[PDB]
C-alpha cells in the first residue's frame, strides 16, 4: 500500500478528421479516419531483497517442479502456442521463528 503508488499512464490515438465540408459548420467533427497504433513498452523495476539468515538444522520447504513425466512442461507453451500458469504460487516457503 502506498499514498503515492506508480502513477497511471494514459495513452490515446490523436483524432484525425476525415475530409470536412467546404462550407463552414459550427458542429464538432464526427467523421474521423479510422486508426490504431502499436509499439513496445519497457518496465524496469528494482527490487530490494531481505535474505534469509536462519540457524535451522533440517532442510526447508522449497517450491519445486514435478519430476514425474507429463505431456507439457509446467509454465511453458502448449502445442498450440498457448502459455499457461498451472497453479498459483505464494512466497511463504522459508520459515522463521516468531
Amino acid at each position: 500500500g502506498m499514498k503515492h503508488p506508480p502513477p497511471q499512464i494514459l495513452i490515446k490515438n490523436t483524432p484525425v478528421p476525415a475530409d470536412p465540408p467546404t462550407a463552414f459548420n459550427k458542429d464538432k467533427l464526427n467523421s474521423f479516419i479510422t486508426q490504431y497504433s502499436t509499439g513496445q513498452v519497457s518496465v524496469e523495476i528494482e527490487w530490494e531483497l531481505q535474505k534469509e539468515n536462519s540457524k535451522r538444522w533440517n532442510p526447508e520447504i522449497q517450491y519445486t517442479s514435478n519430476y514425474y513425466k507429463s505431456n507439457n512442461v509446467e509454465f511453458a507453451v502448449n502445442t498450440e502456442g498457448v502459455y499457461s500458469e498451472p497453479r498459483p504460487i505464494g512466497t511463504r516457503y522459508l520459515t522463521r521463528n516468531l
Binding site: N72, V73, A76, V77, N78, T79, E80, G81, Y83
Partner: peptide, 13 residues
Amino acid sequence: YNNHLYKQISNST
C-alpha cells in the same frame, strides 16, 4: 515463422 508462436513438438506431434 510459427505464426509468431512458440510450439511444443515431439515425435507424438
